[PDB]
Write a protein that binds this ligand. Structure first.
Ligand SMILES: [Mg+2]
Lengths: 95, 106, 96, 82, 95, 106, 87, 96
DNA sequence: ATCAATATCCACCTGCAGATACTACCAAAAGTGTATTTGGAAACTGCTCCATCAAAAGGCATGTTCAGCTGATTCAGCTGAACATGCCTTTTGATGGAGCAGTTTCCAAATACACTTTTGGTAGTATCTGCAGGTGGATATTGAT
DNA sequence: ATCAATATCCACCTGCAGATACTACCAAAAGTGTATTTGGAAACTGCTCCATCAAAAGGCATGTTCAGCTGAATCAGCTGAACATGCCTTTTGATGGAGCAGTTTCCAAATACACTTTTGGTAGTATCTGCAGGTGGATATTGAT
């Protein structure tokens, strides 16, 4: 009966943004879900630790950013960080 | 009324991300920008993977991405490979590679 | 009355299997080995089908990756035949 | 014909994995050694997998149990939940 | 002027229990302090995920116990569970 | 007044261990026996390693335990060694060990 | 503030003698000539990794001073946990 | 004139160095290397003495452990001499 | 080389398991509005310990000389690959029911808070002591022979 | 063996800096006592999906044959160790100043409700298609001659 939350729909939207005529198997979707959860945890975990080191009660985007820098290889980090900063600005330049 | 995702230009669910942060015990408090930044990052990485598995499905005359496609997309990409270097993709197989010394006398 | 030379088939096998992703252990023998081993920690246990599938993907990936390293240890020794020592050396260096 | 479960992991099957691993030629002593190696792998994972199960006061090993065991063994597996 | 906490005094007690005529250098002590901290985090962390996995919002002596079982090897696990159970028992009964 | 440690017959600080379990946000609530158990476990582990290092201090005619003794302790012991498989003891040194083939004669 | 001498080629400060001592503690008997440069290269990669993370911790704490804690956290991240420095 | 045979002083050295715990790289040289590398990441940095010290302990420990692995790799290949393909083999197997 | 035996590959057909699509639908996150709380940037400043410097105390760089190790060469033997032969274990599918997982219940045990008491850390000033570093003098290892 | 040069050992012996002490203090613990909230075991139960058996589906086990790989033996070139020699750079102890870290003030931003709006998940059912598994003959790779 219970709800089974998953990033499947969002993965799909993004997929459609990038490969509009392309589909994805049940199992490939599962993997993609696993991957977002994984990456979510790694990042969130690292930011968790960051605040604790600095005796801060709050996880801000500053912590998310630093986390991303620690976790991602050179260029993947670079892009991610801009992507993040962008989305934050675009949200702040919004009423 | 508009969603935070759209407020930010995202497909990935800010509110959800926001929730998962709190109910995850990462800190007592979670700022406003954190779920946005995070969600942006998760979207981006998803894009990057699908992007390349997309190509890899194409490069093998297919239009459905199965796991193999993800595996090729990851293991042929140096940085994705590092980031997932300790992860196993189910039903993904290995890259075609044979040590040269095993190749017959040409 | 035709015969392939030692090795030629071996490669043919390699390309075929590096091409594919099917599991290469047979599901039943595998499932029994799980339950046999599982028994040692708790008696009368029931396994979800997918849990036994997880353990297979896990295991085979691990062994295939172990074989690559084993292979490199054989080649390091100026051989092409993998032997138990190669495995022991791979394992020692990985920290197992 | 009686035969140990471990011997159920057959020479061809072992051989097939090695092949996917790019292995060309195989000492006949390998197959036993491989079985020892796989046993220790499963032993390690299942122990933890079960420890989870048992903790849940359950009688069934869920895929989650396994996935979480692999994760902590540093053998994260994508695809079966988590 | 904020104080820094350490398990030094307790480490020193237990050293006297096992080796009454034996000293500990401050470097060695620092190492010991590191080890308690490290093992503390490792177990608490294993317990955190345990609770989460099972959708429980409490870390009880039972989550510690399993954490210990996942974390420690063989004879240390056995012994640690003993010592741990023994102390709960004796504490429960003390109140 | 009686410390929770003395109620539990522990040398290790159950108050602290509680305070620390809360502050590290490992979960919403932390049960009452949780710090007791874990303080016990820690106390034990430290006794076990103090024990073997003490021995190593003794075997090298020394009264005071220094890092080499914890190193000797830990690395000569299957289990602690495993527990500290990925840990570096500062000033520890290594176990004296030389490989057969490298010794003179035959 | 007035000057600080340009820093270059300091990897060469990891001399042949010291590399050889490390190798002895590592139980090594004979050493090929090429090893010394390989080791320098290998150490350098090691240090770049650790310092990069340490420095990230430092910057994040808005500090100009790299602390033992910074280094200790960085080593942990990389599964080279270090006892004895605030670990 | 007296002369120890090649290998004999080496073993003396091994015994000597496995017996002690002192850092084997010189402090100052090592410190500048840390500062060089750090400086190339961020300029105008300072270091707690213990930070360099931590770094040095972490590094000598990493290298020594790598020299054992390297040694085993030479000995797998039936040599007693370590060379870069051994180091390189140890690092791949480890996954670095 | 060619010939032929065997393997791979690419063009075409199609059934259906897997994936897409829809809409009822409906609880449960998510968004919005207002009242309440507190976290951590700021401006100021005490105080530590970092960078920097001269003094003095060891270790590295370099060349030479050759022991002995690596790798090349040859090679004889057993060991693993290829492939014949029938032969028994695995896979696939249907079928009650075990047990996980849904749901409500109510209480032991949790958080919350306020006041009292104790303890653990430091700081200033103290005398105590394990042992590192030195001495010389006794015994063992090593390598020429 | 036979000898001797050099390393190894150890036992005794001050010098001290590292550890252990104590007294005096106090801030922040930690304990303690009601007050109030709720997470989760416990009891009850619907329904997956897991065990299991029976029909159908092919591979793995064994033995014979020998190609060619591994390892042994020999070896000469030449690389890496040992050691003398020349000599500079690291270490270590002392002295202002940058920056970190400890206050304290305070508002901008997060949490806490509570109440309205939707979205995402299920599922039921219908509907659709990408490709897996054939086919056929076309071509490619290997090995005998
Ligand atoms: Mg530079």
């Amino acid at each position: 009966k219970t709800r089974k939350e998953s990033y499947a729909i969002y993965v799909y939207k993004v997929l459609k943004q990038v490969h509009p005529d392309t589909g994805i198997s049940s199992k490939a979707m599962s993997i993609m879900n696993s991957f977002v959860n994984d990456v979510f945890e790694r990042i969130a975990g690292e930011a968790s630790r960051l605040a604790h080191y600095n005796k801060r009660s709050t996880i801000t985007s500053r912590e998310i950013q630093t986390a991303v820098r620690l976790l991602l290889p050179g260029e993947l980090a670079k892009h991610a960080v801009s992507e993040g900063t962008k989305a934050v600005t675009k949200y702040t330049s919004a009423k | 009324a508009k969603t935070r995702s759209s407020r930010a230009g995202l497909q990935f669910p800010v509110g959800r991300v926001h929730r998962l942060l709190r109910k995850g015990n990462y800190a007592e408090r979670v700022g406003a920008g954190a779920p946005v930044y995070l969600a942006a990052v998760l979207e981006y990485l998803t894009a990057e993977i699908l992007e390349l598995a997309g190509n890899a499905a194409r490069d093998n005359k297919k239009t459905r991405i199965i796991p193999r496609h993800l595996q090729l997309a990851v293991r042929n990409d140096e940085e994705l490979n590092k980031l997932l270097g300790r992860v196993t993709i189910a039903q993904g197989g290995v890259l075609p590679n044979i040590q040269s010394v095993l190749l017959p006398k040409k | 009355p035709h015969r392939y030379r030692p090795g030629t088939v071996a490669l043919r096998e390699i390309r075929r299997y590096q091409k594919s992703t099917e599991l290469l252990i047979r599901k039943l023998p595998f499932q029994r080995l799980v339950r046999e081993i599982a028994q040692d920690f708790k008696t009368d246990l029931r396994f979800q089908s997918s849990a036994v599938m997880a353990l297979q993907e896990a295991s085979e990936a691990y062994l295939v990756a172990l074989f690559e390293d084993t292979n490199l240890c054989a080649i390091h020794a100026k051989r092409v035949t993998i032997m138990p020592k190669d495995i022991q050396l791979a394992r020692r260096i990985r920290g197992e | 014909v009686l035969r140990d479960n471990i011997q159920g992991i057959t020479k061809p099957a072992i051989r097939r994995l090695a092949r996917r691993g790019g292995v060309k030629r195989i000492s006949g002593l390998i197959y036993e050694e491989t079985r020892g190696v796989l046993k220790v792998f499963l032993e390690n994972v299942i122990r933890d997998a079960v420890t989870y199960t048992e903790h849940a006061k359950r009688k069934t090993v869920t895929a989650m149990d396994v996935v979480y065991a692999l994760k902590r063994q540093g053998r994260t597996l994508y695809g079966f939940g988590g």
